[PDB]
Amino acid sequence: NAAAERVSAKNALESYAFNMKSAVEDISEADKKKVLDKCQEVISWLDANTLAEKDEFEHKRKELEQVCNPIISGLYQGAG
Amino acid sequence: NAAAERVSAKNALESYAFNMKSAVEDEGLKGKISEADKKKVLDKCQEVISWLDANTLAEKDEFEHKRKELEQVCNPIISGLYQG
Structure with a gap:
């Protein structure tokens, strides 16, 4: 159902964001920063959009x- | 340096196609990826590899x-x- 799908999309996003932040803190240093900053922007976005729609x-x-x-x-990598 | 950006782009495309291909052909992903997902990945990897064989000297943005x-x-x- 709709409430279930919405929360599932939300949990998918949250858990990916946090698991990726953690994963990256176990590759390039510029690329680390790219991941961390993006996870952080999605986290802040998620903090302000707790009740957004599944599509969002x-x-x-x-x-x-x-x-x-x-x-x-x-x-x-590898081909170079 | 334009020459280097072009080569970096080509290498990244090549790396991805061959590495993904190998990843999904892995006997230790049996029942972790669906047959439909696997066939899809493989076909796209092959088509890219085949495009790249024909477009070795293409532009960066291609x-x-x-x-x-x-x-x-x-x-x-x-x-x-x-996720799983």
Whole structure:
């Protein structure tokens, strides 16, 4: 149901943001900062948008994963 | 340096295609990724690799477009695996 989907999108975003902040504090130093700052911006956004709609959460999670997924996986490297 | 940015973009695209391909072909992701997700990732990796073989001397921003295309397909999967 709608209430359930909304909270699930929200928890998906929150937990990714915090787990990524932590993960990165176990790669480049500029890239660390990129992740941390983005997680921090999503966290502040989440703090002010606790009752936003499911779509808004999912949108922010896409933004977050776009920045963080490549850096944390090391996927861009090796070919050089 | 334009030459270097171009090469960095090409390398990142190449790295991603081959590394993702290898990641999902991993026998230790059996039942962690759905067959549909896996086939999708693999097909896109192959198409990119095949584009790159034909476009070795393309412009920086063409490699970037291509890379973002690959990301849109891979990111949900990557996120799904870091979530589970």
